[PDB]
Amino acid sequence: GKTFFGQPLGLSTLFMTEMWERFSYYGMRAILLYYMWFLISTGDLHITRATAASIMAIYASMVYLSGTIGGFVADRIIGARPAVFWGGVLIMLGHIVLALPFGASALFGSIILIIIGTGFLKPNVSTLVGTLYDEHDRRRDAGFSIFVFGINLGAFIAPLIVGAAQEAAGYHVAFSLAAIGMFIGLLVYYFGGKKTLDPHYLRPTDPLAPEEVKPLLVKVSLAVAGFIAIIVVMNLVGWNSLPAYINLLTIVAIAIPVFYFAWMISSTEHLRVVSYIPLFIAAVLFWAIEEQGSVVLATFAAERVDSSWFPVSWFQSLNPLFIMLYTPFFAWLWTAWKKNQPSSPTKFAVGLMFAGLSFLLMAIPGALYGTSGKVSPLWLVGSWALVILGEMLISPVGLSVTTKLNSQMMSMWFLSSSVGSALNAQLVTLYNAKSEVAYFSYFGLGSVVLGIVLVFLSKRIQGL
Ligand SMILES: CCCCCCC/C=C/CCCCCC(=O)OC[C@@H](O)CO
Ligand SMILES: CCCCCCC/C=C\CCCCCC(=O)OC[C@@H](O)CO
Ligand SMILES: CCCCCCC/C=C\CCCCCC(=O)OC[C@@H](O)CO
Ligand SMILES: CCCCCCC/C=C\CCCCCC(=O)OC[C@@H](O)CO
Ligand SMILES: CCCCCCC/C=C\CCCCCC(=O)OC[C@@H](O)CO
Ligand SMILES: CCCCCCC/C=C\CCCCCC(=O)OC[C@H](O)CO
Ligand SMILES: CCCCCCC/C=C\CCCCCC(=O)OC[C@H](O)CO
Ligand SMILES: CCCCCCC/C=C\CCCCCC(=O)OC[C@H](O)CO
Ligand SMILES: CCCCCCC/C=C\CCCCCC(=O)OC[C@H](O)CO
Ligand SMILES: CCCCCCC/C=C\CCCCCC(=O)OC[C@H](O)CO
Ligand SMILES: CCCCCCC/C=C\CCCCCC(=O)OC[C@H](O)CO
Ligand SMILES: CCCCCCC/C=C\CCCCCC(=O)OC[C@H](O)CO
Numbered sequence: 001g002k003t004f005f006g007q008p009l010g011l012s013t014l015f016m017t018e019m020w021e022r023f024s025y026y027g028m029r030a031i032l033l034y035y036m037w038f039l040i041s042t043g044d045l046h047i048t049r050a051t052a053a054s055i056m057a058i059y060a061s062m063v064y065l066s067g068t069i070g071g072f073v074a075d076r077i078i079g080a081r082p083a084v085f086w087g088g089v090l091i092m093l094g095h096i097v098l099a100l101p102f103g104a105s106a107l108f109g110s111i112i113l114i115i116i117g118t119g120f121l122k123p124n125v126s127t128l129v130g131t132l133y134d135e136h137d138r139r140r141d142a143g144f145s146i147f148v149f150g151i152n153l154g155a156f157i158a159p160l161i162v163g164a165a166q167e168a169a170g171y172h173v174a175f176s177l178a179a180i181g182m183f184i185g186l187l188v189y190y191f192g193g194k195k196t197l198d199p200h201y202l203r204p205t206d207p208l209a210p211e212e213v214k215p216l217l218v219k220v221s222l223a224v225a226g227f228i229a230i231i232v233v234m235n236l237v238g239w240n241s242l243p244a245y246i247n248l249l250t251i252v253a254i255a256i257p258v259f260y261f262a263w264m265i266s267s268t269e270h271l272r273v274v275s276y277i278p279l280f281i282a283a284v285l286f287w288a289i290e291e292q293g294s295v296v297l298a299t300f301a302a303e304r305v306d307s308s309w310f311p312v313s314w315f316q317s318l319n320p321l322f323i324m325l326y327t328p329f330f331a332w333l334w335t336a337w338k339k340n341q342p343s344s345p346t347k348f349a350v351g352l353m354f355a356g357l358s359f360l361l362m363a364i365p366g367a368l369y370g371t372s373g374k375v376s377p378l379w380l381v382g383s384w385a386l387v388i389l390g391e392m393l394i395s396p397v398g399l400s401v402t403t404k405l406n407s408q409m410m411s412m413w414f415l416s417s418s419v420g421s422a423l424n425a426q427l428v429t430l431y432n433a434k435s436e437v438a439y440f441s442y443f444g445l446g447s448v449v450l451g452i453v454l455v456f457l458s459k460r461i462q463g464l
């Protein structure tokens, strides 16, 4: 009878929950770099703009990493429904912290809250969407597509609204709007969830057995102790600047898949695991370029574009806009393309090439016009158009090609975005007006080349 776009009514609740959470997240992301610039300009924040860019990237890296952990905590300890609720509460607090009359001193607390909160909420709302359907329900894929539409919608409207609020009423009010966005999500989630969600998910579905508690405690304790020890040694040898800590986090984020790879390669489907390395690197490099949209392209938007008549943060709406515009087209495409549809490794290769082209495009205005003036907003429009085209090729088959090639390596796909952002934490420090053309050219061309490399390797990989 009555449905939400053909789906169970409970999808409306989760749709709105994620829409408003993504609203809060991308609303914050769209103005946070500019906020740090402001704090730097007033002498409140004693870092370079390069470091501010680095912060944005490592922030994203840790958000993605945290998301690979939240599912475990919900499934084994607190339950998916409380994970979403309390995750949302932490996220809201994270935005409230930036709305308070503080300056740079509140940045770290806000970042930590949102990292933990998003880690709790993001994997677990997706889990709850699954719970709406039986195993044999063929509506499942349609339901997730609608859910993703809500995600992109929140991501789309947030820079517009939060960016406009920032211009009108300042950063603290704008950040409060992000907080209010999460609050709306929590309201709908809490009261809507009670109506449609299975009570089963109020509790962990795979609770720790009695003998499992101590080994988990030891595991967590040793990890924390090791991490703290590393920080201690860092401060003793004088490696205690902010870039030093960012480097530590970069190393951690990259070492986790590296250790996974070394583990699987050591421990004869050995060929498959090795075959995934080029795909994983391609994913990492793609996500690096895609995630630079809120950092390097955001910098370009503010410094190099004729945008005096609208909030420059609005450029961040282009990424989810193009995802929304492309999605129904590629949905039709992969069904219509019956004969000789490209393999998943081929999609990765071409996807990386489009990401490469998105940067090669951005090298053109500086090379043609110089880098001291300002250029058309359409250069950025074209860039996002290209990189998102790449996303349509690599993202829908990413988890698929990883699974078909089990629980540890599955997480590596989600880790690719974390690793890409960790790489960005290093790379974006190289971007400035002087290096602009070389930056876009070099990393653009590199991605295209590595895409061409993957094309040659596509035949061998598809067989495994
Ligand atoms: C076939 C569907 C593919 C959709 C993606 C295509 C996007 C391609 C974009 C490349 C051209 C955009 C850059 C052009 C540009 O900057 O012109 C500036 C000039 O108009 C200044 O007024
Ligand atoms: C300023 C930095 C603070 C760092 C964040 C501190 C808070 C960290 C974790 C709090 C989240 C705990 C969520 C679990 C909870 O409260 O209920 C779970 C349980 O009741 C469900 O069965
Ligand atoms: C310091 C400012 C933030 C203080 C947070 C106070 C409100 C926190 C979360 C709002 C959640 C909205 C859903 C309302 C709710 O869950 O109330 C539950 C109540 O009816 C019985 O559990
Ligand atoms: C996990 C995959 C890792 C692959 C990373 C590929 C790129 C890694 C390091 C490149 C650093 C050197 C870039 C130096 C550079 O050309 O900067 C350009 C600009 O600053 C002036 O040319
Ligand atoms: C299958 C659809 C997507 C295919 C993408 C086709 C891409 C083909 C060629 C890309 C040309 C790359 C140009 C490299 C370049 O101009 O670098 C010059 C600059 O680095 C000077 O230092
Ligand atoms: C459990 C996996 C997630 C790991 C969470 C640890 C995240 C720790 C730090 C996040 C990165 C933030 C670094 C930038 C930063 O701290 O800015 C603070 C301001 O510079 C204050 O001067
Ligand atoms: C630190 C300030 C935050 C205060 C939050 C309000 C606390 C009052 C009640 C908490 C209710 C916790 C409900 C957890 C939960 O699983 O919600 C799920 C809903 O049942 C819908 O799935
Ligand atoms: C029941 C708790 C749920 C609360 C939802 C989040 C509320 C967030 C902000 C409320 C309004 C905060 C206004 C911020 C503000 O005063 O800006 C100060 C200006 O900078 C002063 O010029
Ligand atoms: C890094 C922040 C998140 C850290 C969460 C890891 C928690 C640390 C050790 C595991 C202890 C979890 C509590 C055990 C529990 O509640 O389950 C009890 C068993 O189900 C009873 O047999
Ligand atoms: C410094 C952080 C390193 C990790 C230490 C975190 C310790 C946090 C919680 C440990 C709680 C001890 C586990 C015992 C427990 O939870 O029993 C609960 C059961 O439900 C009782 O039947
Ligand atoms: C439950 C929260 C526990 C904290 C999460 C663990 C990660 C903690 C720190 C990671 C390193 C980030 C330090 C950033 C920072 O503020 O350094 C600034 C230095 O004072 C440089 O002068
Ligand atoms: C399973 C992941 C475990 C991997 C963690 C291993 C971390 C090992 C070493 C971290 C060293 C931190 C680097 C500090 C650094 O980059 O130099 C400091 C600045 O460059 C100079 O101030």
Ligand SMILES: CCCCCCC/C=C\CCCCCC(=O)OC[C@H](O)CO
Residues within 6 Å of the ligand: 314, 315, 317, 318, 321, 376, 377, 378, 381
């Ligand atoms: C009605 C257009 C489709 C919906 C656009 C949503 C808003 C997304 C981005 C707005 C900021 C970037 C657009 C700037 C722009 O396109 O300017 C083009 C003109 O040629 C300006 O010179």
Ligand SMILES: CCCCCCC/C=C\CCCCCC(=O)OC[C@H](O)CO
Residues within 6 Å of the ligand: 329
């Ligand atoms: C229903 C799927 C088919 C929809 C067709 C999508 C094509 C829409 C826009 C393509 C924009 C192409 C940009 C043209 C261009 O690059 O012109 C460059 C000139 O040199 C600028 O002066």
Ligand SMILES: CCCCCCC/C=C\CCCCCC(=O)OC[C@H](O)CO
Residues within 6 Å of the ligand: none
């Ligand atoms: C289906 C895509 C077909 C190919 C798309 C266009 C490929 C991109 C560029 C092709 C022409 C390359 C010209 C490069 C070029 O002239 O650079 C100028 C010099 O580097 C300036 O010093």
Ligand SMILES: CCCCCCC/C=C\CCCCCC(=O)OC[C@H](O)CO
Residues within 6 Å of the ligand: 357, 360, 361, 363, 364, 366, 367, 437, 438, 441
């Ligand atoms: C399929 C559409 C692709 C549209 C983008 C194609 C871009 C192809 C080549 C652009 C490379 C421009 C590099 C310019 C350059 O490096 O010259 C340096 C100048 O002398 C200034 O440093």
Ligand SMILES: CCCCCCC/C=C\CCCCCC(=O)OC[C@H](O)CO
Residues within 6 Å of the ligand: 361, 364
């Ligand atoms: C199937 C996806 C491929 C889409 C490629 C369509 C774009 C084709 C050509 C766009 C090349 C970008 C360079 C445009 C350019 O430099 O023109 C100069 C501007 O007119 C400056 O006023």
Ligand SMILES: CCCCCCC/C=C\CCCCCC(=O)OC[C@H](O)CO
Residues within 6 Å of the ligand: 325, 326, 329, 378, 381, 382, 385
């Ligand atoms: C797949 C169905 C949806 C297709 C979306 C079409 C978007 C594709 C490309 C948008 C790139 C915008 C560049 C606009 C442009 O270069 O025009 C230049 C002007 O003609 C010169 O003033």
